[PDB]
Amino acid sequence: MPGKIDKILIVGGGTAGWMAASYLGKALQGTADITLLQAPDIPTLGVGEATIPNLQTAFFDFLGIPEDEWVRECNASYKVAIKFINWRTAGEGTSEARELDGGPDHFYHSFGLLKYHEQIPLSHYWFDRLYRGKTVEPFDYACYMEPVILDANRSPRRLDGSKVTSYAWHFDAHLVADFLRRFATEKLGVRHVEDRVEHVQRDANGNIESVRTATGRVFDADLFVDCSGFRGLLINKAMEEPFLDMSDHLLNDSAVATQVPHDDDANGVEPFTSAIAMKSGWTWKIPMLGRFGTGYVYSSRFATEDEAVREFCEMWHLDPETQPLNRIRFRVGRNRRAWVGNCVSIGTSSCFVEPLESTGIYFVYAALYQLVKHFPDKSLNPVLTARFNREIETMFDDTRDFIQAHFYFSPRTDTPFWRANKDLRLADGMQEKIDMYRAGMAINAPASDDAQLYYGNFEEGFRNFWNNSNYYCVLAGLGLVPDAPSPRLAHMPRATESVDEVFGAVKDRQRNLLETLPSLHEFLRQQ
Amino acid sequence: MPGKIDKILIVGGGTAGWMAASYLGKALQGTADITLLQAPDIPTLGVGEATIPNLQTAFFDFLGIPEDEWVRECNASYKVAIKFINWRTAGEGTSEARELDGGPDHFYHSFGLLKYHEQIPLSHYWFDRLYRGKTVEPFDYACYMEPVILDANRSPRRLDGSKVTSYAWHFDAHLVADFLRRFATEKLGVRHVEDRVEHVQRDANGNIESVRTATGRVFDADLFVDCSGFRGLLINKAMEEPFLDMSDHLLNDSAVATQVPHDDDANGVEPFTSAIAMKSGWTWKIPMLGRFGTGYVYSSRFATEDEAVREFCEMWHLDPETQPLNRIRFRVGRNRRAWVGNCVSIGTSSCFVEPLESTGIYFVYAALYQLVKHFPDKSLNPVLTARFNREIETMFDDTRDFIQAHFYFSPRTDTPFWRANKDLRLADGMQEKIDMYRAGMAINAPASDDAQLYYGNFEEGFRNFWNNSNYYCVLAGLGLVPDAPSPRLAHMPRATESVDEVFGAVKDRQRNLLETLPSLHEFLRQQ
C-alpha cells in the first residue's frame, strides 16, 4: 500500500488561502501536517463579497461552525437576490432605476427554484400566457414571491428566527478570512508562517521539491496548494502552466472599488446585491452593517482608469481626490489545468470571472470539495488529477458562458461597450443552451423543485449548478423569450387551466409576507 | 403561433408499438388523434422479459395503472437481481454453477443503491478491508442484503404486501403487449387498424407525408412513430437513416430461445433473472408462473445456428428435434439518429443490445419520456430533435459500454469466444470509467442512497442510469478491483472504524430477513 499524503504547504494567505486551510485542516485532521505561508501586503479596502446559500452547507457546516456564530463574528448581512438595475435602458451610470414601460427598470435573480406544475417549470406557463396576451407581468414578479418583499427591504428571517426563503450573505471578505485564520491555526493546528516566497525548486519530473523563503527557510511537502491569487507563483510561475485568457467572451478586466458609510436607521438594509449597469461595465453594491461595498467593473478597452474613477465617483457622489479607492486589473479566465504534478490551484490563482453572479467564494469551496473528492496518495494517480481538472473547467466555463449572456442579451446600444458585447460569440455550448430556450425548453432543469435538497446536497448543487430558474431570471429578465410557448402545454389543457392556482399562491404569499416580515434592518439589530 | 401535432401514426404493434400508443395516448390525451398500424406476423414463443424497478414508476404509474392490476393480468413474477452463473470459470454450457474458491461460481447484481458512509460508497470500504486482508467476503455478500435471501428464493414482499427491497418483474412480453392494446384502444381512444405497410410517401423536406397500406388506404399524420422493430420500415427504409453496427464492441448477434414447463410447487420460483455463461455467449433464465423463459444469446462469429441449438438444448435436457424453438438473428446497434424529420423511433427500430442487463423495455419507456419531454409543434424545431437524439444516443452507448465490460473483464479464456472478447477495444468513455474505478473512485455515484427517490423520480434514475453500485456489482463480481484503496480512507480513521457497524447491519438484515421472509412461491400462490 502506497504512502498517504503526509505534509501539505499552502502558499498564499488570502481568503482562498485560509479557506483551503480550514477545509483541508478539518478534512485531514490528525493525518496531515498543514503549514500556510503568506507574506506582508498592502491590504485592500473591504469592498465586499456576495455569496450563494450553499456557503453554509458545503463549507461552514463541513467545518462545524454554526451559521449564527460566523455571521455574528464577521458582521454579515443577508442576501436574497441580485437586483439588476438599468440593463435595459440607455444612459449614464446612475444608482437610480430608470423608467421602462411604466415601472422602474430592474429585475431580480433570486435564490431558490421555480415551482414545478405537472412536471413542467412555472416559467413555461408564465411565458405561455405572456405570449398569448393573458398576462403582462414580468417573469420575476409572476413566478417568485421574493421580488415583492425585497422591494420593501423585508428580512429573509422572521423575528423569531424562522426562514421564509433561500438566502446567502454579504460580508467584508477580510473579516471572514481573519475568522478562518484564527479557526485553522487555533482549533485545527495549521502552522502559520509569515514569509515571502523567494525561490521554488523543482525535481526531475517537474514537480515541486521545496519552496524557499526570503529569510532562507526551506519548506517541503507532498502536495502544494497555490493560493497566491492572480500571481500564480506556484501553478503558473514555477510549474510553467499557461493561463488561458478568456476575453473573447468577457470584455471586463478592471475594477475601481471602495467602501461607503451608510445610514441603516434611515434607509434600512437592502436584502439583495445590486448589479448596476454603467456605460463601460456594471457596478456592484453589497450592503453590510452601516457600510456597503461598491465597485465599478469596467472594460479597460472602453474606458480609461480615469474615466472609470469619475463615472464611479459621480454616481455615488464621492470625491475622486479624497475617497480611498482600490484600482484593480483582473486576470479574466483560467489555468489550462488547475492541477499539475503536486501543485493544486485554489482561488484566483486557478480561475477568475467578474462577480456578476457571486461566484468568487463558491469557486474556492467547490474546488476544495472537488480536491478532497479526488484526493491522491503519494503516487499521484493521473486519473485523479485529470478528472479533478475536468470538473474545475466545466465549473469555470459554464459560468463564463452564463455571465457573458448577461451582456450579450442586453438590449442597450448606447455606448461602444454595449454594442461591442453583441459582436462577441457565445461558446458553442452556451449557444446550444439558447437554442433550447427559444424552443421553449427548460435548461438544466432541477431534478427536484425542493430548494433545500438543492443547496443542501452539494453534489446536487454542483452537477446542476446553473439550472432553469437562473436562466429564465436573467434571460427573460433581459427580455429574451422563446420563439413560441413550450409545445407540451398545448397538449396539457388540464394543466394550463389549473396553473393560475399556483400563480395565485405566489400572489398570496407576496401579499402576506409583505405585511408579516420585519425589515432586514430590524432583524440585524436583534443579531 | 404555429400548429400543434394533431395526428400521430404509429407503425408497429409490438410491445414497443403498444407502449408508445399507451404513453402518447395518455400524455397528449384529448389533444391528438393517435392511430396504430399493426399487421399479423409469424407468432413466437413466450421466452420472457426481464425488467427494472422504474417500469412501474416511469411507465405504469404514468398510465395510472396500479402494480397489482397489470401484474395479475399478465401473470408476472418478481425480480430482485440478476444472478451471474459461471462467468469466472471454464467449462461447457451448464445450468449448474461450478466451483470457485470453495463456493458456487455466481455473483449478484441487485437493485438497491449502495449505502453511503460519510458521503463515501460502502464499496470503497469493502475494498479497503479486502486489500488489507481484513476481509475475504465477495462484494455482493458484504455490501448488499439481497444475496442471502435470493439464495433461499424468498419473496421481496412479505405476505402482508409489505416490501423489503427494490424489485422488478418477469413476464411474457405478449401478455403485457395485449393488456396495453386493450388499455390504449379501449380507455384512451387509440385507433387500432390491421394493415400492412406498402408505400411511404415523403415530401421535399424529406419528411413523411403519408403511409399507404396494402389495402390501398393512406394514413397521414403530423408525426410518425416507427415501432416496426428490426425492419425499421420508416426510419431506416423510408428516411434512409443509416444503422450503426456495434460489433466492434458487441459480439453477440444470434439467439435460440424457448419456454419451459416448471413445477412451482415442487421446486419453487427463483426471485431473480439468471445470466448463465456459455461457451459462445450466455443463456438467460426468466422465471414465470409454472413456466420459465430461456434463451441462449450467442455470437454467429463463433457458433453456428446448429451448434447453438445443440448446446442450448443439451443444457436444459430438451430434444433439438421436437422442442419448439425460436431462432433469432438480432440487429445489434443503433441508428445514427433516433429521430429524423417528423419520424421518431421507439423500440428495436431505434436500437437493440442483448438482454444481459434487462434494458429492452426500459429503452422503450425511456425514449417515450424523452419524446414527450422534447415534443414538437408543426414547426419541428431542430433543437428538440437533436437534444432527443442526444439522450437516446448516450443512453444506448453507455449501456453498450457496460454490457461489453461483462465480457471483457471475465477471467475466462477457455473458448475462442472468451479469448476474442479480450481482443476487442473498449470505447474511450468506458476506458475512462475503468481508469477511474482502478483509481479508487466511484463511477457515476448517485446523489442520494435513497433507492425509492432514485427509482421514483425518473429524471434522476435516467441521468444517473448506470451508477457506482451497478459498476461495482459487475466489475467486482468478475474480479476486477482497484489498484489500491481510495486515498481518502487513510485520512478518515473514524469512518473506517465505524463501517464495522454498517457491514454489521447487512448481516443482521440478511439473517433476520432469511428467517422471517416467505418464499416467492408462497407469496405468488397467495396472489
Check: CB of residue A282 under 8 Å from CB of residue A322. no
Return the SS3 of B388: helix
List the grid coordinates of A127.
411565458
Q: What phi and psi, each to the nearest 5 degrees, are found at residue B330?
A: -80, 160
Q: Which helix (H) or strand (E) holds A365?
A: helix A360-373
Which residues of A form the catalytic set?
79
Chain B, nearest residue to A2 by Cα: B484
DSSP 3-state of A420: helix
Please state the domain extents for chain B.
1-527
Query: Grid cell 449572456 — which residue?
Result: A405
A131: nearest CA partner in chain B: B1
Tell whether A1 lies on the interface with B, counting CB pairs under 8 A: yes
Please, are residues B249 and B405 in contact by the beta-carbon 8 Å criterion? no
- A-contacting residues of B 99-138, CB under 8 Å? 119, 131-132
List, by residue number, the catalytic residues of B. Answer: 79
Question: Which residues in chain B have Cβ-Cβ distances shorter than 8 Å to A465?
Answer: none
Distance from CA of B479 to the nearest CA of A (A): 19
Backbone angles phi, psi at A355, to 5 degrees: -80, 35
Distance CA(B256)–CA(A88), nearest Å, equals: 68
Contacts of B218 (CB under 8 A, 6+ apart): B201, B210, B211, B212
CB atoms within 10 A of CB A513: 19
What DSSP letter does each residue of A203-235 carry, written as one string? -TTS-EEEEEETTS-EEE-SEEEE--GGG-III
Q: Which residues contact B359 (CB under 8 A, 6 or more apart)?
A: B52, B353, B399
Biggest CA-to-CA distance, chain A? 76
Rounded Cα–Cα distance for residues B137 and A358 (Å): 49
Contact by Cβ (8 Å): B20, B45: no
Whether chain A has a CB inside 8 Å of the CB on B216: the answer is: no
Q: Please state whether beta strands B351-352 and B333-335 pair in parallel, antiparallel, or not at all (unpaired).
A: antiparallel
- Return d(Cα B441, Cα B127) in angstroms, integer: 11
Does an H or E element contain B419, and which?
helix B416-420
Decide the pairing of beta strands A351-352 and A333-335: antiparallel
User: Could you tell me if B366 and B462 are in contact, meaning their C-beta atoms sit under 8 angstroms apart?
Assistant: yes
Cα→Cα distances B39→A205, B36, B42, Å: 69, 10, 10
B488 touching A (Cβ < 8 Å):
yes
Cell of B432: 475512462
Ranges of H-type helices in B145-249: 146-150, 173-187
At residue A264, what are phi and psi to the nearest 5 degrees? -70, -30
Give the list of residues 6+ apart from residue A90 with CB closer than 8 angstroms, or none: A412, A413, A414
Cβ of residue B230 closer than 8 Å to a chain A Cβ: no
* B489 in contact with A, Cβ within 8 Å: no
Residue A226 to residue A222: CA distance in whole angstroms: 13
Half-sphere CA count of A19, side-chain side, radius 13 A: 32
B381: Cα within 13 Å, side-chain hemisphere: 26
Bridging pattern class, strands B191-194 and B33-38? parallel
Distance between A64 CA and the closest CA of chain B, angstroms: 15
Of A344, A329, A331, the closest CA to residue A388 belongs to: A344
Number of H-type helices and E-type strands within chain B = 20, 22
d(CA A487, CA B250): 38
Q: How was this structure determined?
A: X-ray
- Give the closest-approach CA distance of A1 to chain B in angstroms: 7
Q: Do residue A4 and residue B487 have CB atoms under 8 angstroms apart?
A: yes
Angle CA B433–B435–B436, to nearest 5: 65
Of the candidates B197, B212, B185, B170, the residue with the CA atom closest to the CA atom of residue B79: B170
Within 10 angstroms of residue B497's Cβ, the number of other Cβ atoms is 9
Contact assessment for residue B190 and residue B36, using Cβ atoms and an 8 Å cutoff: yes
Q: Name chain B contacts of A438, Cβ cutoff 8 Å.
A: 381, 383
Adjacency order of strands within the sheet including A339-340? A191-194, A33-38, A7-11, A223-226, A343-345, A339-340
**C-alpha grid cell, residue B168:** 422488478
Determine contact, residues A486/B376, Cβ cutoff 8 Å: no
Q: What is the DSSP letter of A56?
A: I
Stated resolution in angstroms: 3.0
Check if the beta carbon of residue A527 is closer than 8 Å to that of residue A157: no
Taken as a whole, chain A contains a residue count of 527
Residue with the three cell numbers 484526493: A375
Q: How far does Cα B289 stand from its chain's mean position?
A: 21
CA distance B289 to B274: 16
The nearest CA of chain A is from the CA of B173 a distance in Å of 29
The whole-angstrom separation of Cα B211 and Cα B237 is 12
Task: Write out the three cell numbers for B12.
Answer: 408497429
| Residue whose cell numbers read 454489521 | B504
**Cα dist from B362 to A78, A341, B59, whole Å:** 46, 43, 9
Distances in whole angstroms, Cα of residue A143 to Cα of each of A139, A477, A502, B161: 6, 12, 9, 42
Number of Cβ within a 10 Å radius of residue A94? 16
Integer distance in angstroms from the first to the last C-alpha of chain A?
52
Number of inter-chain CB pairs under 8 A, A vs B: 100
Chain B residues closer than 8 Å to A377 by CB: 484, 487, 490
Interatomic CA distance for residues A375 and A23, integer angstroms: 13
Are A447 and A515 in contact by the 8 Å Cβ rule? The answer is: no
The answer to whether B436 and A373 are in contact (CB under 8 A) is no
Contact indicator for A175, A289 with CB cutoff of 8 Å: no
Q: What does the buried/exposed string (b/e) look like for A50-62 if buried means 16 or more CB atoms within 10 Å of the residue's CB?
A: bbbbbbbbbbbeb
* Chain A residues touching residue B447 (CB < 8 angstroms): 447, 457, 459-460, 463
Q: What is the 3-state secondary structure (H, E, C) of A461-504?
A: HHHCCCCHHHHHHHHHHHCCCCCCCCHHHHHCHHHHHCCHHHHH
Report whether A225 contacts A346 (CB < 8 A): yes
DSSP characters over A251-315: ---EEEEEEEE--HHHH---SSEEEEE-SSEEEEEEE-SSEEEEEEEE-TTTS-HHHHHHHHHHH
d(CA B170, CA A144): 46
Nearest to A377 among B119, B463, B487 (CB): B487
Query: Tell me, which fold does domain A1-527 have in CATH?
Result: FAD/NAD(P)-binding domain (3.50.50)
CA atoms within 13 A on the CB side of A300: 12
Name the 3-class secondary structure at A15: helix
Contact B384 A438 (CB under 8 A): no
Q: Please give the DSSP secondary-structure letter assigned to residue A105.
A: S
Pairing of strands B218-220, B208-213: antiparallel
Local structure of B73: helix, strand or coil:
helix
Query: Could you tell me the three cell numbers for B212?
Result: 399507404
CB A198, CB A213: distance < 8 Å: yes
3-state class of B426 per DSSP?
A: coil
The CA-atom distances, in angstroms, between B206 and each of A110, B223, B239, B240 are 45, 13, 7, 10
Does A451 touch chain B if contact means CB atoms closer than 8 Å? Answer: no
Question: At which residue does the C-alpha cell 485542516 appear?
Answer: A25
**Residue located via cell numbers 444472478:** B83
CA distances from B84 to A408, B103, B111, B409, B477 (A): 55, 14, 14, 13, 9
Phi and psi angles of residue B258, each rounded to the nearest 5 degrees, phi first: -155, 180
Hey, what's the torsion of the CAs at B12, B14, B16, B20, to 10 degrees? 60
CB B299 within 8 A of CB B354: no
Distance CA A52, CA A454 (A): 12
Q: Which of residues 14-73 of B touch A (CB under 8 A)?
A: 27-28, 30-32
Cell representation of residue A452 = 433545500
SS3 content of chain B, % helix, strand, coil (to 5): 40, 20, 40
Query: For residues B343 and B121, is the Cβ–Cβ distance under 8 A?
Result: no
Q: Is the Cβ–Cβ distance between A258 and A296 less than 8 Å?
A: no
